[PDB]
């Protein structure tokens, strides 16, 4: 119901989600020299999203602000948890425990994606309350 043609928030949340998805789908058959740069991708995507959000806050109801900020905070946290796991799977490279730590990357990542999506919903709301939509 909201025109997206010039909605970066959306556009960026979409990138972040894709980054995750493509990483989580290429993860199992892959080596560290392949999944680290993938994770870096997620980061860059997350970073870009966050900046965009920052500039958007100044144009949304002071009310919402707090939540959006909290939501932002989570996203960062998530990425970290991901990076930690990535380091782990990186350590136990060719071993009996690699394919197991990778599954933890998967979980971390998926969380990131879910929260990224919620950030969108929170902001989508601000946008609607601001544009003055009915009940």
Swiss-Prot record:
Effect noted on mutating residue 129 to E: In a metastatic melanoma sample; somatic mutation
List residues modified as Phosphotyrosine. Answer: 10
* Interaction with ARHGEF28 as annotated region, ranges: 1-135
Q: Domain of life of the organism in this record?
A: Eukaryota
Regarding how it is modified after translation, the entry says: Phosphorylated on tyrosine residues upon activation, e.g. upon integrin signaling. Sumoylated; this enhances autophosphorylation.
Where in the body, by tissue, does this protein show up? Detected in B and T-lymphocytes. Isoform 1 and isoform 6 are detected in lung fibroblasts (at protein level). Ubiquitous. Expressed in epithelial cells (at protein level).
Q: Where does the record place it? A: Cell junction, Focal adhesion; Cell membrane; Cytoplasm, Perinuclear region; Cytoplasm, Cell cortex
Q: Where is the signal peptide?
A: none
Q: What do we know about how this protein assembles, alone or with others?
A: Interacts (via first Pro-rich region) with CAS family members (via SH3 domain), including BCAR1, BCAR3, and CASS4. Interacts with NEDD9 (via SH3 domain). Interacts with GIT1. Interacts with SORBS1. Interacts with ARHGEF28. Interacts with SHB. Part of a complex composed of THSD1, PTK2/FAK1, TLN1 and VCL. Interacts with PXN and TLN1. Interacts with STAT1. Interacts with DCC. Interacts with WASL. Interacts with ARHGEF7. Interacts with GRB2 and GRB7. Component of a complex that contains at least FER, CTTN and PTK2/FAK1. Interacts with BMX. Interacts with TGFB1I1. Interacts with STEAP4.
Q: What does this protein do?
A: Non-receptor protein-tyrosine kinase that plays an essential role in regulating cell migration, adhesion, spreading, reorganization of the actin cytoskeleton, formation and disassembly of focal adhesions and cell protrusions, cell cycle progression, cell proliferation and apoptosis. Required for early embryonic development and placenta development. Required for embryonic angiogenesis, normal cardiomyocyte migration and proliferation, and normal heart development.
Domain comment in the entry: The Pro-rich regions interact with the SH3 domain of CAS family members, such as BCAR1 and NEDD9, and with the GTPase activating protein ARHGAP26. The C-terminal region is the site of focal adhesion targeting (FAT) sequence which mediates the localization of FAK1 to focal adhesions.
Q: Which family does it belong to?
A: Belongs to the protein kinase superfamily. Tyr protein kinase family. FAK subfamily.
Q: Which disease is it linked to?
A: Aberrant PTK2/FAK1 expression may play a role in cancer cell proliferation, migration and invasion, in tumor formation and metastasis. PTK2/FAK1 overexpression is seen in many types of cancer.
Q: What is this protein called?
A: Focal adhesion kinase 1
Organism, by scientific name, is Homo sapiens
The lineage is: Eukaryota, Metazoa, Chordata, Craniata, Vertebrata
Q: Which gene encodes it?
A: PTK2
Q: Which residues of the full protein are shown?
A: 916 to 1050 of 1052
């Amino acid at each position: 119901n909201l025109d997206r043609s010039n909605d970066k928030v959306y556009e960026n949340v979409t990138g972040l989600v894709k980054a995750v998805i493509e990483m989580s789908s290429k993860i199992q058959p892959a080596p560290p020299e392949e999944y680290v740069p993938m994770v870096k991708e997620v980061g860059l995507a997350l970073r870009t999203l966050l900046a965009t959000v920052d500039e958007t806050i100044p144009l949304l109801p002071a009310s919402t602000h707090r939540e959006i900020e909290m939501a932002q905070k989570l996203l960062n946290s998530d990425l970290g948890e991901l990076i930690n796991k990535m380091k782990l799977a990186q350590q136990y490279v060719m071993t009996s425990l690699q394919q197991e730590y990778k599954k933890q990357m998967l979980t971390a990542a998926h969380a990131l994606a879910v929260d990224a999506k919620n950030l969108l919903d929170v902001i989508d709301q601000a946008r609607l309350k601001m544009l003055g939509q009915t009940r």
